[PDB]
Design a protein around this ligand. Structure first.
Ligand code: HEC
Ligand code: HEM
Ligand code: HEM
Ligand code: HEM
Ligand code: HEM
Ligand code: FES
Lengths: 122, 244, 39, 85, 383, 181, 72, 291, 48
C-alpha cells in the first residue's frame, strides 16, 4: 500500500509544474467523475483502505460531526450497492463536496509514524 | 495442422437421439447390431458389450441367449485338466474375430482395427464422425494424393489415408424389419448402435437428466422467490441522518 | 419426521410424471414398442 | 483484529442515524422484478460495458489476426511462407 | 445462552454459518466460496464412491473405469459427477480468484487468507492432475509422462527425483498406484487447507464490492446469504446437471477413452481445460527448467500481488484504469488457456510468448504502476 | 417522535394470515423439493453399493451335473458359497424315511429338502457364523460344522450344535443330468 | 438409390456449391497437367487438390446434414 | 502480543500445546492421549504408503501385500508398522478408556467429551476390522464373512442390507474394494472426530488423579507435559520397535498368511486380538440378533 | 543373489529351466531359458 504521504508528495510534484498540472488535472477530474463512487454518496476519503493502523488512528481522531457524516455516507453506499441503485444526479456528491476531509489526519498519522521510525534508527 | 491432418470436420446430422429429450431409436440399435455382426465382426472386436447388455435394448432375452449359444467360449479345464469349451451364455462378452493385436495386424496389412465399444467417445466427431467415415469414401481420390499401398482415401480420417476401405454397399444386409439397406441407412444404423455401445446409459442418463432439471429448476425458482421475499426488509430499508 | 414422508410424495409425483411423459414422447423409439416389428 | 462480533464490530461511534424497515410479510415481494431486471440491468450493463469491451476487443483482435494468419499458412498459397518460418 | 452458542460445536457452526456478520452489500460473487466448499464435498463424496470400484492397477485402471461406467448401477452418474464436478470446481475457483483480484480481497487485512488461497489452488491443481492420471487413457498416460519429463529438468536432483515420482523407469503400475493413493489423500489435506482458509477469513471477515469497511452495516448469515447461497447452489447444480446428464464429455478430451499405450503418442497432448493456461505458459518458455519455473511462478505470483498493488483504495469497483487492466488480464488469461490446446505453430509460439510476458507483466508492472497512477489521479482530482 | 417514510406503495395487499400462509407454503415446498432431490441423489449413490450388473450376471449359473458315485459329496462355487451337491444312495433316503417331529430344531424331510435322492443339493454354508462344514465328520452322518462341532443330518437338518436353522438348500432346479439355477 | 448420393448430387448443383465445384475440377485438371510433365516424380512440391476437395465437401455437408435423416 | 498468540493458526497451536493450562498433578496416564494421536498419524502415515502399493482386487490383495513385504524397498517395515501400530493404537486406546474409567474423566463437566470418545472407539473398531479384511488371508476373509452373516440378523432389513455390504452375494471383489476405499477414508473421519474430542477437552480441560479441581494449581504445557509426552512417546516407540523389528507377527494370527479360500473354512475364526472381548460377548448370546 | 548363491549361480540355475515367453509374431507359442527375474516354478501347473 502506498503511504498517503507519498501520494501527496507526488500530487504536489505534479501540481507545482504548470504543464503537468494543465494536462493531468482535467484528466484527474474526469477520472474521479468516471470512477462512479460519487453517485453512491461516497466522498473520496470514504473509499480509503480503513484496515491499517495509521488509517485506523486517523479515523479514531476525527471530529464527531465528520465521524457521523462519514458513518452515514458509508451506510448509504452500502444500502445503494445492496439495492443495486444509484443516487440521482441532484443527490450525488458534487465535485465541490468531495473535500478531502480525512487527508489532514492521515498525514498527521503518517508524520508521527515516520518520526518514530526515523528516531528509532537514529 | 493442415486441414488434411486434422481430418475434414464431420457435419452435424439431426440424429433421432440428439435433442435433450430423445432416446436411441432402439430399432436403429438393433439394425446397427445386425450391421455390426454382418460386416464389422470380421475385423472389429467390440469386447466391452456383453450379450446381457442387449436384453431390453435391441434383443429379447431369448434372442440374446440364443445368439450366445452358437458361439464357443473357453471353459475351466476338465477334471483330468484338459482344455474344455462351452456354449456361450448371456454373461459372456461378445468375442472379437482375432485372438490378439498381433493376429489383427497380420490379417489387416498391419493396421489394427480398434475396438468399437468406445469408438464414439474416442473420436472428435462422435457419432457423426463414424457416419461421415463410412460414407465419406469418394469414388475417385482427389487428384495429386498418393496413398501408401493398402490404404484407402477417406477425407474424414486424420491424414486422409485409412486402411479400412469402404465396406458398406447398397443392399449388403437384408434387414429383419424389411427396412431398405441403402449404404446411408446402414451407416446410420451402425453409428447409432456403436453410440449405444459406447453410451449404454444414454437413455436412462437423459431421463434422469429431465427429472433433475425439473426438480432443480422448480427448486431454483422457489429459492429466488424465498430470497427476494426474505430480503425485502433489507432492500426496503430507509435511513435518516439528522445531526444538529 | 414428516420431511421424509413428504419426500416420498414429491419424488413420486415428479417420477411418475416424467416416466409418463418420457414414454409418450419416445413411444415410437422405445424397445418395448419396437420389439413387435422384429419378433 | 478489524472485525469483532456483533456487540463491537469495530464501527466508529455511530449516532443520529435512524433505520426504518417493514416486515417481509407486510411488503410486496418481487415488486418491480420484471421492470427492474430489464431497465436497471441494462443501465448496469451500459455503465460497465466499455471496461469489458475495449479489453475484449483488443484481445479478440489479436486472437483473430493470429488465427487467420495460422489458417493462411497451412494452405497451398501459404506453403512458401510457412517454409520461410 | 441459546444452545447454538453454549455448545462448542454448535457454537462453531453458529460463528461460521448462522451469526457470521457478513457485510450487507456483498454480491453473488461472494457465494462462490460456498459453492467451492460444496464442490469439495461432491469431489469427495462421488470420489469415495469411485474408489469403491476403481482398481488402481495399470492393466485394470481403464477397464475398471469402464466397469464403473457400464456395470455399476449408477456408476455412470458417479463418474460423470466426479469429472464434470472437478471441472466445475475449477470454474468456481477461477471465479473466486477473479473476484478476489477485482475487489481487493487480497489486501492488507487478509493477506494470510490470500496466501492460503494460493496454496489451495496449487494443491488442487495437483489433485486434479493426479486424478486425471488415474483414468489411464491415452491423454492420461501421456500427460503424466510429459509432466514427469519436464520435472526431470531440476538442475541436479531432477535426474533422481523423477524415478521416485515414477516408482520405476517410466509411467507404469507403481506410478498409477501411487497417484491413486495421493489423489485419494490430498483432497483431505485440501479440506484441512479449506478449514484454514475459513479461519483466516473469520479472523477479519469478508470484503465488499464497494471496498469500504463493512462494520458500519453488517447482517447475520442465517436469514441472509444462506438463502442467497441456496440460489447460487441451485444455479450451480442446474448447470452441473445440464452438463452431467447432457453432453457430459464436452469438457473432456475424446482421446482419454483410448486405453493408454506408451508405444503410440496421440497427435496432441493437452491437459484438462482448467490447466491449459499454465501449460501454455510452460510451452512459451523454451528451456525446460525455465518453463517449469515460469509455470510455477504463474501461480505463486499471486502471493506477490498483495504487495505490488499500491492502491490506497481496496478493489476495482471505483477505479477506471484498474478495471481496464483487470479485464485485459482476464482476457489474456483466457487467451493463454486457448493457446494451451493449440499446436506449437508459427504465429502461436510468438503469441504465447507475448501472452506469458503480459501475464507476468500484469502483476509486476501494470498493477503497481496503474495503482500508483490512480492514487495520484484521485488525489489531484479531489483537490 | 418523527415522521416515517411512506411505505404505502411497498405494502402487500394480502391479509395477515394469507401472506404468512403463502410464505410458509413456499418455504415448505422448497424444503420438501430439496428433500426429494437429496433422496434421489442419495438413493442413486447408494445403489452403487448394490451388486453391479456383472455380479448379478455371474450368479444363477448352472453347474455341470452328471453321473457321480453314490454317496459322494461334490462341491461347487455357485454365488461364492460352496454347494454340497451329493448323490446320496438309497441308504440315505431310507435313513431319512424315519420322520422326526421332536429333537430337531426344524423338523423336515427329504420331501422338501430334495427333489430326488439321485441328486441332493444343499449350500455348505453353516447356520451360526456361516462356515463350510466337513463332508464326513457330521455326528448325524452328514456334514459337520468344524467351528462349533455342529452336526448336519443327511437331510440337511440341524441335529446338534449351535445351528440356528437347517442346512440351507439352494433354489437350484433339476433337469436331465443338469443343474438349472 | 441411397438418399445420400442423390442429396450430394443435388447440393453440388446448388449455386452456393457451384464455385467450389468449379475450383475443384480446375484443380483436378491442373494436377493432371503437372503429372503429365516427365520430371513430376522429381518435384519437391507435388500439388494436390485436397484443399479444394475439402472446401467442396464442407459446402456440400452444410447442405446435406439437415436434410439427410429425413429420408431415412 | 507474542506471535504465538497474535496469529490465529499459532494461536490455536498455543491454546492446545504451548499454554494449555494442564493440571499439575496428572500422572503419565494423561500422556496416552498424545500417543493415540501419534498412533493416528502413524496408522495414516504408513497407511498412505501401503495404498501406494496395495492393489484392492480380490485376486491381487494378498499377492499385493506380499509384493509390499518382499519387493518394495522398506515395504516390510511399512506393513509391520501399519499392523503392529494398529495393535498398539488399540492398546493405547484401551488404556485411555481404562484411565477414564478409573478416574472419573467421564463425569459431569466432560460427559460430552466422553460421548465423542465412545464414538471414536466404535469408529476405530470398524476401521481396524475393515483394514484387516484388506489382507484377504484366510482369517481376513472368514472374519468378513462371519461379520456380514451376523449383521444379516436385522429383523427385516437384514436380508437386504447384507448384499449392499457385500456388494454381491458373498465376500468377493466388490466387498474388498469397498472395504479398501472406506478404510482409506474413515481414518480421516476419525481425525475429525479426534479434533472434536480435543475441542470438548479444551472447553473444560482435563481431570486429575485426585479428582478435585485443578484450577487452584495449573501448569503450562510447553515445558511441562510436553517433555512428559516425550518420555511416553519414546517408551511407546521403543516397545513398538521391539515388536515391529523383533517378532512382528506375535500379535497377528498365522492363518492370515494363507490366501483367502471360501471353499475351506479354517479350524477357528477369531478377530484380531483387540476385538476378541466383544467377539466373546457376541458368542455368549445365542440369538444372532441378540448377539 | 547375495543370500545363498552368487549372481552367476542364480543366473545359471535360471537358464536350466524353461519359461513361457510372449508368443512369436506368427502367433505360435514360444519359450525362453529362465532369467533372474523369473520366479521359481512349481512342479504342477495348477492346484488340480
Ligand atoms: C477389415 C479389415 C475391417 C472391417 C470389416 C471393419 N474394420 Fe474398421 N478398421 C479396420 C482397421 C485395420 C482399421 C485401422 C485403420 C487405421 O488407420 O488405424 C480400421 C479403422 C476403423 C475405425 C477407426 C477410425 C479412426 O480411428 O479414425 C473405425 C471407427 C472403424 N474402422 C469402424 C468400423 C465399422 C463401423 C465397421 C463395420 C463393419 C468396421 N470398422 C469393419 C479393419 C476393419
Ligand atoms: C475449496 C476451495 C475454497 C473454498 C471452500 C474457499 C472458501 C471460501 C469462503 C467460504 C469464502 C467466503 C465467501 C466469499 O468470500 O466468497 C472465501 C472467500 C475467499 N476466497 Fe476462498 N476458498 C477456496 C479457495 C480459494 C482459492 C484457491 C483462492 C485464491 C487463490 C481463494 C481466495 C479467496 C479469498 C481471498 C477470499 C476472501 C474474499 C473476500 O474477503 O473478499 N479461495 N473462500
Ligand atoms: C478437490 C478434490 C478433488 C478433485 C478436484 C478431483 C478431481 C478429479 C478429476 C478431474 C478426475 C479425472 C476423472 C476423469 O476425468 O474421468 C478425478 C479422478 C478420480 N478421483 Fe477425484 N478429485 C478430488 C478428490 C477425490 C477424492 C476425495 C476421491 C476419493 C476416492 C477421488 C477419487 C477419484 C477417483 C477414484 C478417480 C478415478 C477417475 C475414474 O475412475 O473415473 N477424488 N478426480
Ligand atoms: C486409526 C486408523 C487406522 C487403523 C487403526 C488401521 C489399522 C489397520 C490394520 C490393523 C490393518 C491390518 C493390516 C494387516 O493385518 O496386515 C490395516 C490395513 C491396512 N490399512 Fe490401516 N489403519 C488405519 C488407517 C489407515 C489409513 C489412513 C490408511 C491409508 C491408506 C490405511 C491403509 C491400510 C491399508 C492399505 C491396509 C492393507 C494392509 C496391507 O496391505 O498390508 N489405514 N489397517
Ligand atoms: C485417536 C484416539 C484419541 C485421541 C488422539 C484422543 C485425544 C485425547 C487427548 C490429547 C487427551 C488429553 C490427554 C489425556 O487426558 O490422556 C484425551 C483425554 C481423554 N480421552 Fe481421548 N482421545 C482419543 C480417543 C478416546 C476414546 C476412544 C475415548 C473413550 C472411549 C477417550 C476418552 C478420553 C477422555 C474422557 C479424556 C479426558 C480425560 C480427562 O480429562 O481425565 N479418548 N484424549
Ligand atoms: S459354525 Fe458357528 S455355529 Fe455353525
Amino acid at each position: 500500500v502506498q503511504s498517503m504521504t507519498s501520494v501527496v508528495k507526488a500530487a504536489n510534484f505534479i501540481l507545482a509544474r504548470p504543464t503537468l498540472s494543465k494536462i493531468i488535472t482535467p484528466l484527474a477530474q474526469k477520472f474521479t467523475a468516471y470512477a462512479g463512487y460519487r453517485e453512491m454518496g461516497l466522498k473520496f476519503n470514504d473509499l480509503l483502505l480503513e484496515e491499517t493502523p495509521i488509517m485506523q488512528t486517523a479515523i479514531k481522531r476525527l471530529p464527531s460531526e465528520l465521524n457521523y457524516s462519514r458513518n452515514f455516507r458509508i451506510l448509504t453506499a452500502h444500502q445503494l450497492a445492496l439495492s443495486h441503485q444509484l443516487l440521482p444526479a441532484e443527490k450525488a456528491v458534487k465535485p465541490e463536496e468531495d473535500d478531502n476531509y480525512l487527508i489532514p489526519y492521515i498525514l498527521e498519522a503518517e508524520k508521527e509514524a515516520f518520526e518514530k521510525a526515523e528516531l528509532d534508527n537514529i | 495442422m493442415t486441414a488434411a491432418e486434422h481430418g475434414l470436420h464431420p457435419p452435424a446430422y439431426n440424429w433421432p437421439h440428439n435433442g435433450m429429450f430423445e432416446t436411441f431409436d432402439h430399432a436403429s440399435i438393433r439394425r446397427g447390431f445386425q450391421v455390426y455382426r454382418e460386416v464389422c465382426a470380421a475385423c472389429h472386436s467390440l469386447d466391452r458389450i456383453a450379450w446381457r447388455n442387449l436384453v431390453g435394448v435391441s434383443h429379447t432375452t431369448s434372442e440374446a441367449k440364443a445368439m450366445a449359444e452358437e458361439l464357443e467360449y473357453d471353459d475351466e479345464p476338465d477334471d483330468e485338466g484338459k482344455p474344455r469349451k462351452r456354449p456361450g451364455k448371456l454373461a459372456d462378452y461378445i468375442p472379437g474375430p482375432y485372438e490378439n493385436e498381433q493376429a489383427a495386424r497380420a490379417a489387416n496389412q498391419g493396421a489394427y482395427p480398434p475396438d468399437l465399444s468406445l469408438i464414439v467417445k474416442a473420436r472428435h466427431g462422435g457419432s457423426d464422425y463414424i457416419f461421415s467415415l463410412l460414407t465419406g469414401y469418394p469414388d475417385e481420390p482427389p487428384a495429386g494424393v498418393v496413398l501408401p499401398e493398402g490404404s484407402n482415401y477417406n477425407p474424414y480420417f486424420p491424414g486422409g489415408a485409412i486402411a479400412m476401405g469402404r465396406v458398406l454397399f447398397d443392399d449388403l444386409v437384408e434387414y429383419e424389419d424389411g427396412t431398405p439397406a441403402t449404404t446411408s441407412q446402414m451407416a446410420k444404423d451402425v453409428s447409432t448402435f456403436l453410440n449405444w455401445a459406447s453410451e449404454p446409459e444414454h437413455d436412462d442418463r437423459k431421463k434422469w437428466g429431465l427429472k433433475a432439471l425439473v426438480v432443480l429448476s422448480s427448486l431454483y425458482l422457489l429459492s429466488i422467490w424465498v430470497k427476494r421475499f426474505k430480503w425485502t426488509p433489507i432492500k426496503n430499508r430507509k435511513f435518516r441522518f439528522d445531526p444538529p | 419426521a414428516t420431511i421424509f414422508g413428504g419426500a416420498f410424495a414429491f419424488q413420486g409425483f415428479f417420477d411418475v410424471a416424467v416416466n409418463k411423459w418420457w414414454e409418450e414422447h419416445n413411444k415410437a423409439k422405445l424397445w418395448k414398442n419396437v420389439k413387435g416389428k422384429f419378433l | 483484529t478489524y472485525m469483532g462480533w456483533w456487540g463491537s464490530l469495530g464501527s466508529p461511534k455511530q449516532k443520529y442515524i435512524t433505520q426504518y424497515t417493514i416486515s417481509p410479510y407486510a411488503a410486496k415481494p418481487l415488486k418491480g422484478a420484471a421492470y427492474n431486471a430489464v431497465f436497471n440491468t441494462f443501465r448496469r450493463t451500459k455503465n460497465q460495458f466499455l471496461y469489458v469491451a475495449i479489453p475484449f476487443v483488443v484481445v479478440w483482435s489479436i486472437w483473430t489476426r493470429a488465427r487467420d494468419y495460422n489458417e493462411y499458412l497451412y494452405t497451398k498459397e501459404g506453403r512458401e511462407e510457412l517454409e520461410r518460418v | 445462552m441459546p444452545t447454538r452458542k453454549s455448545n462448542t460445536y454448535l457454537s462453531l457452526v453458529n460463528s461460521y454459518l448462522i451469526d457470521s456478520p457478513q457485510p450487507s452489500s456483498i454480491n453473488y460473487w461472494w457465494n462462490l466460496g460456498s459453492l467451492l466448499g460444496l464442490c469439495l464435498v461432491i469431489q469427495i463424496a462421488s470420489g469415495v464412491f469411485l474408489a469403491m470400484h476403481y482398481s488402481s492397477n495399470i492393466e485394470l485402471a481403464f477397464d475398471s473405469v469402464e466397469h464403473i461406467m457400464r456395470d455399476v448401477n449408477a456408476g455412470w452418474l458417479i463418474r460423470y459427477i466426479h469429472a464434470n464436478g472437478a471441472s466445475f470446481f475449477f470454474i468456481c475457483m477461477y471465479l473466486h480468484i477473479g473476484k478476489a483480484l477485482y475487489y481487493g480481497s487480497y489486501k492488507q487485512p487478509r493477506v494470510m487468507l490470500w496466501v492460503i488461497g494460493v496454496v489451495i489452488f496449487i494443491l488442487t491443481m495437483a489433485i486434479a492432475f493426479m486424478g486425471y492420471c488415474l483414468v489411464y487413457g491415452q491423454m492420461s498416460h501421456w500427460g503424466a509422462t510429459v509432466i514427469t519429463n519436464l520435472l526431470s529438468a531440476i538442475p541436479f536432483i531432477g535426474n533422481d527425483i523423477v524415478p521416485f515420482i515414477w516408482g520405476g523407469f517410466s509411467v507404469s503400475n507403481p506410478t498409477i498406484q501411487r497417484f491413486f493413493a495421493l489423489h485419494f489423500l490430498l483432497p483431505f489435506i485440501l479440506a484441512a487447507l479449506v478449514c484454514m482458509h475459513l479461519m483466516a477469513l473469520h479472523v477479519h471477515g469478508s470484503s465488499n464490492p464497494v471496498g469500504i469497511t463493512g462494520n458500519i452495516d453488517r447482517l447475520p448469515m442465517h436469514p441472509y446469504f444462506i438463502f442467497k447461497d441456496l440460489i447460487t447452489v441451485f444455479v450451480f447444480l442446474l448447470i452441473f446437471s445440464l452438463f452431467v446428464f447432457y453432453s457430459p464429455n464436452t469438457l473432456g478430451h475424446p482421446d482419454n477413452y483410448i486405453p493408454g499405450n506408451p508405444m503410440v503418442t496421440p497427435p496432441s497432448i493437452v491437459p484438462e481445460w482448467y490447466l491449459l493456461p499454465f501449460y501454455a505458459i510452460l510451452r512459451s518458455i523454451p528451456d525446460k527448467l525455465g518453463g517449469v519455473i515460469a509455470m510455477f511462478g504463474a501461480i505463486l505470483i499471486l502471493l506477490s500481488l498483495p504487495y505490488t498493488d499500491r492502491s490506497i483504495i481496496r478493489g476495482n469497483s471505483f477505479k477506471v484504469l484498474s478495471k481496464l487492466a483487470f479485464y485485459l488480464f482476464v482476457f489474456n488469461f483466457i487467451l493463454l488457456g486457448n493457446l494451451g490446446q493449440l499446436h506449437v505453430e508459427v504465429p502461436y509460439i510468438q503469441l504465447g510468448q507475448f501472452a506469458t510476458a503480459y501475464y507476468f507483466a500484469h502483476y509486476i508492472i501494470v498493477v503497481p504502476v496503474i495503482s500508483t497512477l490512480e492514487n495520484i489521479l484521485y488525489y489531484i482530482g479531489t483537490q | 417522535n418523527y415522521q416515517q417514510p411512506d411505505y404505502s406503495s411497498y405494502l402487500n395487499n394480502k391479509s395477515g394470515q394469507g401472506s404468512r400462509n403463502f410464505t410458509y407454503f413456499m418455504v415448505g415446498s422448497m424444503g420438501l423439493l430439496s428433500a426429494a432431490g437429496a433422496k434421489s441423489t442419495v438413493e442413486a449413490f447408494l445403489s452403487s453399493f448394490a451388486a453391479s450388473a456383472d455380479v448379478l450376471a455371474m450368479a444363477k449359473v448352472e453347474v455341470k451335473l452328471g453321473a457321480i458315485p453314490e454317496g459322494k459329496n461334490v462341491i461347487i462355487k455357485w454365488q461364492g458359497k460352496p454347494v454340497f451337491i451329493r448323490h446320496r444312495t438309497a441308504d440315505e433316503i431310507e435313513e431319512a424315511n424315519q420322520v422326526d417331529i421332536k429333537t430337531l430344531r426344524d423338523p423336515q424331510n427329504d420331501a422338501d429338502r430334495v427333489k430326488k435322492p439321485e441328486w441332493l443339493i444343499m449350500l455348505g454354508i453353516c447356520t451360526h457364523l456361516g462356515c463350510v462344514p466337513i463332508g464326513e465328520a457330521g455326528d448325524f452322518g452328514g456334514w459337520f460344522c468344524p467351528c462349533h462341532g455342529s452336526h448336519y443330518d443327511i437331510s440337511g437338518r440341524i441335529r446338534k450344535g449351535p445351528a440356528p436353522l437347517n442346512l440351507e438348500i439352494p433354489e437350484y432346479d433339476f433337469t436331465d443330468d443338469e443343474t438349472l439355477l | 438409390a441411397d438418399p445420400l448420393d442423390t442429396l450430394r448430387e443435388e447440393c453440388t448443383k446448388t449455386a452456393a456449391c457451384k464455385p467450389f465445384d468449379h475450383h475443384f475440377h480446375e484443380c483436378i485438371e491442373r494436377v493432371t497437367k503437372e503429372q503429365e510433365e516427365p520430371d513430376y516424380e522429381h518435384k519437391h512440391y507435388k500439388e494436390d487438390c485436397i484443399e479444394e476437395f475439402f472446401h467442396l465437401q464442407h459446402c456440400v455437408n452444410d447442405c446435406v446434414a439437415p436434410r439427410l435423416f429425413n429420408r431415412l
